[PDB]
Amino acid sequence: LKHGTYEKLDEDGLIAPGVRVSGDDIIIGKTTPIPPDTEELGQRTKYHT
Amino acid sequence: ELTERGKLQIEPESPYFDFKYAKNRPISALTATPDLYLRMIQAENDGLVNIKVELPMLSTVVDHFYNILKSDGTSEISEKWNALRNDAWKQSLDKLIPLVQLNVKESIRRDCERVLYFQVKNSFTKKIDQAPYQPPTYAKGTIPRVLTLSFGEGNRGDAVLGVFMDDSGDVKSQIKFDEDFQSRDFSDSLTRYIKSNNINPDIIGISGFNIHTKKLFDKVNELVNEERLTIEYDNSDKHLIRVIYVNDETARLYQHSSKSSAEYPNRPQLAKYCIGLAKYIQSPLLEYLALDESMYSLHI
Amino acid sequence: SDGKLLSLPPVSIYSKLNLNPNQQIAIDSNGVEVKVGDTVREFTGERRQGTILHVYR
Amino acid sequence: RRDFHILNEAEIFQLLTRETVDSFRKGMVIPVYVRKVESSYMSVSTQSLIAGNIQRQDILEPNDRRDPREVYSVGQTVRACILDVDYYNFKCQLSLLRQFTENQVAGLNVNRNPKFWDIESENRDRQEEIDKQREESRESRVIKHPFFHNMKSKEAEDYLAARPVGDVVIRPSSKGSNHITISWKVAPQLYQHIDVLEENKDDANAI
RNA sequence: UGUAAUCCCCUUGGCGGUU
Numbered sequence: 001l002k003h004g005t006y007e008k009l010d011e012d013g014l015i016a017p018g019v020r021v022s023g024d025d026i027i028i029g030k031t032t033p034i035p036p037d038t039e040e041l042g043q044r045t046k047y048h049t
Numbered sequence: 050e051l052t053e054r055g056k057l058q059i060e061p062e063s064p065y066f067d068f069k070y071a072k073n074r075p076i077s078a079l080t081a082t083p084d085l086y087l088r089m090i091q092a093e094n095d096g097l098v099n100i101k102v103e104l105p106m107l108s109t110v111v112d113h114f115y116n117i118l119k120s121d122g123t124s125e126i127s128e129k130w131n132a133l134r135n136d137a138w139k140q141s142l143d144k145l146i147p148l149v150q151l152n153v154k155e156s157i158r159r160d161c162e163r164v165l166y167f168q169v170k171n172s173f174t175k176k177i178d179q180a181p182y183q184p185p186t187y188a189k190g191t192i193p194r195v196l197t198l199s200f201g202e203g204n205r206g207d208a209v210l211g212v213f214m215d216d217s218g219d220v221k222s223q224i225k226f227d228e229d230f231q232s233r234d235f236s237d238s239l240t241r242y243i244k245s246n247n248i249n250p251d252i253i254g255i256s257g258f259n260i261h262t263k264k265l266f267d268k269v270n271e272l273v274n275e276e277r278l279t280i281e282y283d284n285s286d287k288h289l290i291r292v293i294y295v296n297d298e299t300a301r302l303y304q305h306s307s308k309s310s311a312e313y314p315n316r317p318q319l320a321k322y323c324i325g326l327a328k329y330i331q332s333p334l335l336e337y338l339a340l341d342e343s344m345y346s347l348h349i
Numbered sequence: 350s351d352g353k354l355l356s357l358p359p360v361s362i363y364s365k366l367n368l369n370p371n372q373q374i375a376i377d378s379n380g381v382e383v384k385v386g387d388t389v390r391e392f393t394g395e396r397r398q399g400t401i402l403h404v405y406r
Numbered sequence: 407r408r409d410f411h412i413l414n415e416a417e418i419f420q421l422l423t424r425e426t427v428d429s430f431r432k433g434m435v436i437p438v439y440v441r442k443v444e445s446s447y448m449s450v451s452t453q454s455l456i457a458g459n460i461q462r463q464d465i466l467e468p469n470d471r472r473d474p475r476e477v478y479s480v481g482q483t484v485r486a487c488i489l490d491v492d493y494y495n496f497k498c499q500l501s502l503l504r505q506f507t508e509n510q511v512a513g514l515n516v517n518r519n520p521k522f523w524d525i526e527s528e529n530r531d532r533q534e535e536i537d538k539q540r541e542e543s544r545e546s547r548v549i550k551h552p553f554f555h556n557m558k559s560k561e562a563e564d565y566l567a568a569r570p571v572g573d574v575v576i577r578p579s580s581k582g583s584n585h586i587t588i589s590w591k592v593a594p595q596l597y598q599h600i601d602v603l604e605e606n607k608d609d610a611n612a613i
Numbered sequence: 614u615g616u617a618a619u620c621c622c623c624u625u626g627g628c629g630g631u632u
Contacts, residue, residue: 001618001619001620002618002619002620003618003619003620004618005618006618038317040225040317041210041317041318041319042200042201042207042208042210042317042319043206043207043208044206044207044208044226044227044228044229045208045227046205046206056531057394057395058394060394061512061514063352064351066514066516067514067516069528070523070524070525070527070528071522071523071524072521072522072523072524073521073522074522178407178408179407179408179409179410179411180407180408180409180410181410182409182410183409183410189409205615205616256421257422259422259423259455260422260423260454260455260456260496261455262422263422263496293412293413294413294418294421296413296421297421301363301364302360302361302363305360305364306360307360330410334407342358342360342361343358343360343361345361346357346361371439371451372453372455374437374439374453374483375437376437376483376484376485380484380485382482382483393535393538393539406453441614442614449614
């Protein structure tokens, strides 16, 4: 993840108008899928996909 | 005796500190405590200490043998002859002492080694002497159906793995519990797995790597006490399914052995660990045999 | 930890002792905390010094 | 074969904590890690995840009247001595009193009977190593001054011998780096050494 | 006691700024 803050994003991954933003803040939240690793061994669904 | 290396290296925490300044230790009592003599020899081989064997009555033997050997003459010529004889006898004693010391040292070494060998043999026999767990209402020697549940460590992100094996010794089904073990969902899913699928395991084994497994054991015991999960008995005070801890040296070694990988190429390491635990419960002797060479590295 | 040397196959070894900094903690003679990689000198004996590689008990 | 062997409290403790009952018992000092600080108690964690607690009577010295939070904080590990062990519940109580954390030195139970133990040799080696500890190192002092000269007492007197009456030389004193000896010629073949005590010294070589 | 995160193209092209 980026070192900025994701707390200004809404549920849909987009910031809302009227919100003050600073440098390195995340204004668009996007993720790309990755083939899962062998973490399904003992991770309680908390594995990076 | 202590060399300079012994003077500096024998610390209060080192195992060699037990005999840093021992003195006049009886030989006959050494055989009852072989490890002390073995450790003294080991320290000697390290160039730290020197083991010395001495007799309190050595002068008595020297004087007696001199009296046997000495002449009874009193003339100055006889005095010179007696002096020559005594000096040669002292030189002979000087030459003879080290060989006798070495022979006695070797004898005590062999005795202590044999004693410790027998002790290790008895310890190993005690370790590997245990029949498989006997389920109630069955004769001794019957192989029970077993279910193993484990999560390993218990850090945030540690799911609980379950592996069930029948009396045949073949894996029947493996399940994952991906919810928190303290949630109602975990207990409900475990109860459904236990009852609905007709698994009916005779004994449940729980093991781990740290104290976090204790909470899982307590939670499982409470669940068993709450849902009255009695064992199915083939055709009436039905008995509850036992939940115990399992020793896991063989399981730990099996989770790393390539034999498991060849046997189970598409299974996680925790599944292999649970399978090893279940096989140990079914038959400890065969699991101890499966160690092959790594059995010698067990703490016996 | 005893000071001896052993030779074993990779299979025989149990596992690596993964310890967090909350577990791998060292305290010197005076009671000051000393962490991984710090340089300390033996108080007595050979009075040697070196960098800490791992802390156990 | 005997029936299946069920682990007991000691065996379960050894299996889980990987710590033997002998190595973890009363009268042992371990570097526990402070996890929570409270006014009436402190909650600490050992190396082997064994949670521990100390009642307020022992975090601070009985003479001191400070607060536990001011002296000790989270993340500040300290030495502690085991008082009680709950093997079944993996709970232990600790003491921070120096009568345990410091006085407990010869914790081994090795029989020191003079008949079979050479107490005299161990004592002699003990004063040998203690005298070695007392041994230290010292070096010379360098001062920059026109009338300062690194000479002995006799050396200073001989240096002033070739000089007329009243000339002054300055040399380091034997009473310490905080002292200075000043030698001046009272009369032909007559010299006075005066010791000067230094205060508020910036450095050993400094004035 | 639940304990928070560290990483970024490359090649071309254009348009500019200061001399």
